């Protein structure tokens, strides 16, 4: 890992770690063994929404153009914001070093009905 990334887990706790550029945040999460409740279930294949992440505004603006394939899975995600993206679709870049991504928590009991 050449760049650093901060993950704000659902329990407030922060998990700092480094991942070499080119890797999706799912790669950063998986290989670094971060404990994020059921993160990346389909293993980054656009079949779930468990890798959902909330990026910083100053970084969201310059991320790869979101596809329909990603929006299709993102609509089914809870805790959706205006800076949400599927973590496994975002490959790290040099400008992302030290950024802070937040894993959506809040009240998702609403999705269970």
């Amino acid at each position: 890992d050449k760049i650093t990334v901060h993950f704000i887990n659902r329990d407030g706790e922060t998990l700092t770690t480094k991942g070499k550029i080119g890797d999706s945040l799912l790669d950063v999460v998986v290989q670094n063994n971060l404990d994020i409740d059921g993160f990346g279930a389909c293993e980054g294949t656009l079949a779930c929404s468990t890798c959902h992440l909330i990026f910083e505004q100053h970084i969201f603006e310059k991320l790869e153009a979101i596809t329909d394939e990603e929006n299709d899975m993102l609509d089914l995600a809870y805790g959706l914001t205006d800076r949400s993206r599927l973590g496994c679709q975002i490959c790290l870049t040099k400008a992302m070093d030290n950024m802070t991504v937040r894993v959506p928590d809040a009240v998702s009991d609403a999705r269970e009905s």
């Binding site: 409740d37 609509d75 009991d109």
Partner: protein, 457 residues
């Protein structure tokens, strides 16, 4: 410290995610997963379509959990039959029911037993290798097929029915079903719902796949989307994009390329609205189903208990195959556990089974058959947590607990031989080999007795 003994009834997503949560958030807790089938994973194996392999990837995470030293698998054990819930409650500190929703919603209409009428989920288990469905042998010689209900399951069987057979060649779809699908003369599939477009139960991913299915064209009536535009523009995010895709497809003239594609299409799928199945119409010799009588309905009686009610006008639809995909319901498996026949679930307060200390539940048996795998996952974590929370607070049986030491001896006395996860791995390896030759991920073993012969059982 105490070494928690937890039992999970059912090895599908809800059971494996509850166990996953328990193992992750308690370093000494042990989880034993019971399953009536010979193999694990439930609907991820038997439900998720074979042309949806990406979704079956959650199996890798369950396999990792099952491999944990604090987890054990016990297939070929039908709780409530081979072992009672009361007996599991004596052996463990906590028991979690995660046996999904097996029962199928009957149409309850004249002629629903005519040959050619199947449960959409029986058709699915057919091509997905569920043993009980391997001899379904549906007659696909007729041109039209009608699917009652507009959920994702409906789109799944409609998609499998219209997908060019060759495109399914290298999926883990049973060779038996693929063979039948090659001889199928089904070219028209109608998905009929009791309500309107704003009520479709499917997601945009599965719909998009349908709209772009090779060799097919969509049959949507623009009239079903009249004075419905402004309501779409105001819908919530999850709903909006879905509806806009339907409205677009139903009312916008396709580009030169798309039109050419449709003019070339040899198969078609469509959506019917405001029609409830009134009766399955028989063939001349009355030996099979030849069509279905649909009653025109109206939104009448709104509020919480909203429902569509027949106006009195009917419409007879020609069709040789009728698939019922109108949801399902769990079923009681033990007289020791309470049951809500109306909602079709085990009465519970956020996971805690009503009036039964130490008894919990998760998945479809807890919330109903309306959640995808991600929904089931986050729901199952909540149950695992409320259980750990009761443990910490001291609200679960104190002390000892023999767990499997007791149940093993018990099942032994009863002549029930359990299938361990490692036994499953020998079977798994076998199915994967059989998939080598034909270039498929695997070739599922369908014969119950052969699967057991393999394991030495």
């Amino acid at each position: 410290e105490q070494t928690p003994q937890i039992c999970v009834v059912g090895s599908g997503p809800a059971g494996f995610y509850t166990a996953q949560h328990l193992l992750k958030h308690h370093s000494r807790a042990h989880v034993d997963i019971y399953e009536k089938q010979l193999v694990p994973f439930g609907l991820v194996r038997f439900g998720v379509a074979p042309d949806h392999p990406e979704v079956k990837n959650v199996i890798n995470t369950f396999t990792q959990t099952a491999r944990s030293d604090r987890c054990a698998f016990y297939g070929n054990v039908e709780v409530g039959r081979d072992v009672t819930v009361q007996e599991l409650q004596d052996a463990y500190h906590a028991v979690v029911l995660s046996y999904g929703a097996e029962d199928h919603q009957a149409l309850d209409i004249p002629g629903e037993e005519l040959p050619g009428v199947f449960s959409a989920r029986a058709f699915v288990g057919w091509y997905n290798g569920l043993p009980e469905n391997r001899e379904l042998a549906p007659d696909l010689s007729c041109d039209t097929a009608v699917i009652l209900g507009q959920g994702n399951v409906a789109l799944d069987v409609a998609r499998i029915l219209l997908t060019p057979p060759d495109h399914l060649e290298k999926t883990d779809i049973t060779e038996a079903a693929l063979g039948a699908l090659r001889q199928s003369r089904v070219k028209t599939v109608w998905i009929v719902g009791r309500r309107g477009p704003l009520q479709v139960a499917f997601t945009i991913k599965e719909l998009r796949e349908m709209i772009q299915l090779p060799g097919t064209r969509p049959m949507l009536d623009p009239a079903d989307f009249l004075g419905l535009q402004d309501r779409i523009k105001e819908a919530a995010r999850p709903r909006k994009r879905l509806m806009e895709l339907l409205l677009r497809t139903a009312t916008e003239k396709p580009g030169v390329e798309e039109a050419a594609r449709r003019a070339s299409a040899s198969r078609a799928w469509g959506l019917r609205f405001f029609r409830s199945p009134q009766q399955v119409l028989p063939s001349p010799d009355g030996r099979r189903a030849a069509g279905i009588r649909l009653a025109v309905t109206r939104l009448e009686g709104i509020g919480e208990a909203t429902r569509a009610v027949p106006t009195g006008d009917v419409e007879d639809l020609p069709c040789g195959l009728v698939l019922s995909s109108i949801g399902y319901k769990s079923r009681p498996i033990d007289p020791s556990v309470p049951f809500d026949p109306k909602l079709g679930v085990v009465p519970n307060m956020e996971g805690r089974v009503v009036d039964v200390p130490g008894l919990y539940c998760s998945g479809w048996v807890k919330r109903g058959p309306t959640g995808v795998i991600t929904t089931t996952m986050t729901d199952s974590f909540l149950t695992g947590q409320i259980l750990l929370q009761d443990l910490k607070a001291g609200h679960l049986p104190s002390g000892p607990r023999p767990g499997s030491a007791f149940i093993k001896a018990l099942l032994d006395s009863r002549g029930v031989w359990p299938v361990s996860f490692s036994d499953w791995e020998k079977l798994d390896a076998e199915e994967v080999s059989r998939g080598q030759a034909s270039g498929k991920p695997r070739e599922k073993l369908l014969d119950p007795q052969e699967m057991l012969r393999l394991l030495g059982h």
